[PDB]
Scaffold this active site. Sequence first.
Site, PDB file in Angstrom:
ATOM      1  N   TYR A  36     -46.619  -1.175 -30.761  1.00  0.00           N
ATOM      2  CA  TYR A  36     -47.599  -0.782 -31.794  1.00  0.00           C
ATOM      3  C   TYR A  36     -48.702   0.069 -31.187  1.00  0.00           C
ATOM      4  O   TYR A  36     -48.964   0.011 -29.979  1.00  0.00           O
ATOM      5  CB  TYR A  36     -48.203  -2.005 -32.485  1.00  0.00           C
ATOM      6  CG  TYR A  36     -49.202  -2.750 -31.644  1.00  0.00           C
ATOM      7  CD1 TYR A  36     -48.802  -3.781 -30.811  1.00  0.00           C
ATOM      8  CD2 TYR A  36     -50.541  -2.397 -31.647  1.00  0.00           C
ATOM      9  CE1 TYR A  36     -49.711  -4.450 -30.007  1.00  0.00           C
ATOM     10  CE2 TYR A  36     -51.464  -3.062 -30.856  1.00  0.00           C
ATOM     11  CZ  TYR A  36     -51.047  -4.093 -30.035  1.00  0.00           C
ATOM     12  OH  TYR A  36     -51.936  -4.769 -29.255  1.00  0.00           O
ATOM     13  N   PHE A  46     -59.294   1.738 -30.317  1.00  0.00           N
ATOM     14  CA  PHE A  46     -57.835   1.941 -30.193  1.00  0.00           C
ATOM     15  C   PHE A  46     -57.246   0.818 -29.340  1.00  0.00           C
ATOM     16  O   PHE A  46     -57.924   0.281 -28.454  1.00  0.00           O
ATOM     17  CB  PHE A  46     -57.539   3.328 -29.616  1.00  0.00           C
ATOM     18  CG  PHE A  46     -56.067   3.629 -29.514  1.00  0.00           C
ATOM     19  CD1 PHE A  46     -55.385   4.185 -30.583  1.00  0.00           C
ATOM     20  CD2 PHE A  46     -55.360   3.333 -28.356  1.00  0.00           C
ATOM     21  CE1 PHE A  46     -54.026   4.441 -30.497  1.00  0.00           C
ATOM     22  CE2 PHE A  46     -54.004   3.606 -28.263  1.00  0.00           C
ATOM     23  CZ  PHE A  46     -53.340   4.155 -29.335  1.00  0.00           C
ATOM     24  N   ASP A  47     -55.996   0.465 -29.620  1.00  0.00           N
ATOM     25  CA  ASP A  47     -55.242  -0.540 -28.838  1.00  0.00           C
ATOM     26  C   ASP A  47     -53.757  -0.243 -29.017  1.00  0.00           C
ATOM     27  O   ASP A  47     -53.374   0.144 -30.114  1.00  0.00           O
ATOM     28  CB  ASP A  47     -55.630  -1.955 -29.273  1.00  0.00           C
ATOM     29  CG  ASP A  47     -54.701  -3.033 -28.748  1.00  0.00           C
ATOM     30  OD1 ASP A  47     -54.438  -3.037 -27.533  1.00  0.00           O
ATOM     31  OD2 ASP A  47     -54.238  -3.845 -29.564  1.00  0.00           O
ATOM     32  N   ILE A  66     -52.841 -10.554 -38.309  1.00  0.00           N
ATOM     33  CA  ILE A  66     -53.472 -10.197 -39.606  1.00  0.00           C
ATOM     34  C   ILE A  66     -52.408 -10.128 -40.707  1.00  0.00           C
ATOM     35  O   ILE A  66     -51.222  -9.841 -40.417  1.00  0.00           O
ATOM     36  CB  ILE A  66     -54.291  -8.903 -39.504  1.00  0.00           C
ATOM     37  CG1 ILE A  66     -53.479  -7.718 -38.978  1.00  0.00           C
ATOM     38  CG2 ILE A  66     -55.551  -9.143 -38.686  1.00  0.00           C
ATOM     39  CD1 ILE A  66     -54.156  -6.404 -39.228  1.00  0.00           C
ATOM     40  N   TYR A  92     -59.592  -7.822 -41.276  1.00  0.00           N
ATOM     41  CA  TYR A  92     -60.739  -8.651 -40.818  1.00  0.00           C
ATOM     42  C   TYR A  92     -61.770  -8.858 -41.934  1.00  0.00           C
ATOM     43  O   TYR A  92     -62.783  -9.528 -41.668  1.00  0.00           O
ATOM     44  CB  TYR A  92     -61.340  -8.031 -39.561  1.00  0.00           C
ATOM     45  CG  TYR A  92     -60.345  -8.016 -38.433  1.00  0.00           C
ATOM     46  CD1 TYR A  92     -60.202  -9.108 -37.598  1.00  0.00           C
ATOM     47  CD2 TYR A  92     -59.462  -6.958 -38.274  1.00  0.00           C
ATOM     48  CE1 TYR A  92     -59.247  -9.129 -36.596  1.00  0.00           C
ATOM     49  CE2 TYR A  92     -58.509  -6.957 -37.271  1.00  0.00           C
ATOM     50  CZ  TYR A  92     -58.401  -8.047 -36.429  1.00  0.00           C
ATOM     51  OH  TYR A  92     -57.460  -8.032 -35.441  1.00  0.00           O
ATOM     52  N   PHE A 109     -52.154   1.208 -38.338  1.00  0.00           N
ATOM     53  CA  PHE A 109     -51.190   0.855 -37.272  1.00  0.00           C
ATOM     54  C   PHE A 109     -49.923   1.674 -37.412  1.00  0.00           C
ATOM     55  O   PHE A 109     -49.436   1.877 -38.536  1.00  0.00           O
ATOM     56  CB  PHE A 109     -50.764  -0.605 -37.320  1.00  0.00           C
ATOM     57  CG  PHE A 109     -51.787  -1.579 -36.813  1.00  0.00           C
ATOM     58  CD1 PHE A 109     -52.729  -2.106 -37.681  1.00  0.00           C
ATOM     59  CD2 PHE A 109     -51.759  -2.030 -35.500  1.00  0.00           C
ATOM     60  CE1 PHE A 109     -53.648  -3.041 -37.233  1.00  0.00           C
ATOM     61  CE2 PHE A 109     -52.674  -2.979 -35.059  1.00  0.00           C
ATOM     62  CZ  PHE A 109     -53.621  -3.471 -35.925  1.00  0.00           C
TER      63      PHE A 109
HETATM   64  C1  LIG Z   1     -54.257 -14.468 -40.212  1.00  0.00           C
HETATM   65  O1  LIG Z   1     -55.280 -13.528 -39.853  1.00  0.00           O
HETATM   66  C2  LIG Z   1     -55.541 -13.303 -38.511  1.00  0.00           C
HETATM   67  C3  LIG Z   1     -54.702 -13.626 -37.448  1.00  0.00           C
HETATM   68  C4  LIG Z   1     -55.085 -13.332 -36.143  1.00  0.00           C
HETATM   69  C5  LIG Z   1     -56.293 -12.690 -35.867  1.00  0.00           C
HETATM   70  C6  LIG Z   1     -56.656 -12.403 -34.528  1.00  0.00           C
HETATM   71  C7  LIG Z   1     -56.395 -10.947 -34.076  1.00  0.00           C
HETATM   72  C8  LIG Z   1     -54.914 -10.613 -33.815  1.00  0.00           C
HETATM   73  O2  LIG Z   1     -54.766  -9.155 -33.839  1.00  0.00           O
HETATM   74  C9  LIG Z   1     -53.976  -8.636 -34.819  1.00  0.00           C
HETATM   75  O3  LIG Z   1     -53.474  -9.316 -35.712  1.00  0.00           O
HETATM   76  C10 LIG Z   1     -53.765  -7.228 -34.786  1.00  0.00           C
HETATM   77  C11 LIG Z   1     -52.292  -6.914 -34.881  1.00  0.00           C
HETATM   78  C12 LIG Z   1     -51.564  -7.325 -33.586  1.00  0.00           C
HETATM   79  C13 LIG Z   1     -52.087  -6.533 -32.421  1.00  0.00           C
HETATM   80  C14 LIG Z   1     -53.605  -6.633 -32.253  1.00  0.00           C
HETATM   81  N1  LIG Z   1     -54.324  -6.569 -33.551  1.00  0.00           N
HETATM   82  C15 LIG Z   1     -55.527  -5.931 -33.639  1.00  0.00           C
HETATM   83  O4  LIG Z   1     -56.079  -5.925 -34.750  1.00  0.00           O
HETATM   84  C16 LIG Z   1     -56.143  -5.265 -32.509  1.00  0.00           C
HETATM   85  C17 LIG Z   1     -57.164  -4.138 -32.977  1.00  0.00           C
HETATM   86  C18 LIG Z   1     -58.046  -3.638 -31.813  1.00  0.00           C
HETATM   87  C19 LIG Z   1     -59.053  -2.628 -32.275  1.00  0.00           C
HETATM   88  C20 LIG Z   1     -58.271  -1.469 -32.880  1.00  0.00           C
HETATM   89  C21 LIG Z   1     -57.456  -1.950 -34.046  1.00  0.00           C
HETATM   90  C22 LIG Z   1     -56.421  -2.948 -33.598  1.00  0.00           C
HETATM   91  C23 LIG Z   1     -56.762  -6.203 -31.604  1.00  0.00           C
HETATM   92  C24 LIG Z   1     -56.485  -6.185 -30.236  1.00  0.00           C
HETATM   93  C25 LIG Z   1     -57.104  -7.081 -29.351  1.00  0.00           C
HETATM   94  O5  LIG Z   1     -56.851  -7.122 -28.000  1.00  0.00           O
HETATM   95  C26 LIG Z   1     -56.091  -6.058 -27.398  1.00  0.00           C
HETATM   96  C27 LIG Z   1     -58.012  -8.031 -29.845  1.00  0.00           C
HETATM   97  C28 LIG Z   1     -58.323  -8.047 -31.194  1.00  0.00           C
HETATM   98  O6  LIG Z   1     -59.221  -9.021 -31.580  1.00  0.00           O
HETATM   99  C29 LIG Z   1     -59.761  -8.899 -32.897  1.00  0.00           C
HETATM  100  C30 LIG Z   1     -57.690  -7.138 -32.064  1.00  0.00           C
HETATM  101  O7  LIG Z   1     -58.654  -8.947 -29.016  1.00  0.00           O
HETATM  102  C31 LIG Z   1     -57.908  -9.826 -28.097  1.00  0.00           C
HETATM  103  C32 LIG Z   1     -56.842 -10.522 -28.889  1.00  0.00           C
HETATM  104  C33 LIG Z   1     -55.567  -9.791 -28.659  1.00  0.00           C
HETATM  105  O8  LIG Z   1     -54.486 -10.675 -28.869  1.00  0.00           O
HETATM  106  C34 LIG Z   1     -54.147 -11.054 -30.149  1.00  0.00           C
HETATM  107  C35 LIG Z   1     -53.079 -11.951 -30.232  1.00  0.00           C
HETATM  108  C36 LIG Z   1     -52.641 -12.392 -31.467  1.00  0.00           C
HETATM  109  C37 LIG Z   1     -53.270 -11.940 -32.619  1.00  0.00           C
HETATM  110  C38 LIG Z   1     -54.357 -11.072 -32.579  1.00  0.00           C
HETATM  111  C39 LIG Z   1     -54.786 -10.608 -31.329  1.00  0.00           C
HETATM  112  C40 LIG Z   1     -57.122 -12.360 -36.936  1.00  0.00           C
HETATM  113  C41 LIG Z   1     -56.747 -12.664 -38.253  1.00  0.00           C
HETATM  114  O9  LIG Z   1     -57.481 -12.387 -39.386  1.00  0.00           O
HETATM  115  C42 LIG Z   1     -58.774 -11.831 -39.206  1.00  0.00           C
END
Ligand SMILES: COc1ccc(CC[C@H]2OC(=O)[C@@H]3CCCCN3C(=O)[C@@H](C3CCCCC3)c3cc(OC)c(c(OC)c3)OCCCOc3cccc2c3)cc1OC
Length: 118
Positions: A36, A46-47, A66, A92, A109
């Site tokens: 992704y 960005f990630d 999410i 979020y 994404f």
């Molecule tokens: C049911 O609803 C939720 C479930 C889980 C979460 C926690 C965040 C979750 O991240 C995600 O679901 C998405 C999609 C998968 C890949 C990472 N995700 C992100 O948004 C990134 C984001 C980064 C900023 C630019 C946009 C993308 C993204 C990347 C990140 O690190 C590279 C990050 C992060 O934290 C918010 C978000 O911080 C460190 C966390 C890492 O690892 C994970 C591991 C598993 C899940 C995630 C992040 C929030 C929810 O609702 C608000």
Amino acid sequence: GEDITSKKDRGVLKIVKRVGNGEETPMIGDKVYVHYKGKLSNGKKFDSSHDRNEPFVFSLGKGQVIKAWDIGVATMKKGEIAHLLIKPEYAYGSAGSLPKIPSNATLFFEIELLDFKG
Ligand SMILES: COc1ccc(CC[C@H]2OC(=O)[C@@H]3CCCCN3C(=O)[C@@H](C3CCCCC3)c3cc(OC)c(c(OC)c3)OCCCOc3cccc2c3)cc1OC
């Protein structure tokens, strides 16, 4: 993009960017393997799985990710690349996730579905 929400609230809009090679869509509970690229729709943050050269692995429909991902990846075939435009309700929300994600952020994404197992 196509509205792939049950509510038809335009919360997750999908554009196929590469048509998949596989016939199968993953089932709820399946272990799914993706690459992704994610960003805020205004591109402040960005990630990518490619940053770590590691596929991202999660259980489909567990709420491990999410809502937009559980909804979006459930529509994908093996080899498919999808672009998802995601309104706050499916990411979020009004809470946001500072410092990374502001309140009522639209996310974008690219997801590549590599494979999955029951
Ligand atoms: C049911 O609803 C939720 C479930 C889980 C979460 C926690 C965040 C979750 O991240 C995600 O679901 C998405 C999609 C998968 C890949 C990472 N995700 C992100 O948004 C990134 C984001 C980064 C900023 C630019 C946009 C993308 C993204 C990347 C990140 O690190 C590279 C990050 C992060 O934290 C918010 C978000 O911080 C460190 C966390 C890492 O690892 C994970 C591991 C598993 C899940 C995630 C992040 C929030 C929810 O609702 C608000």
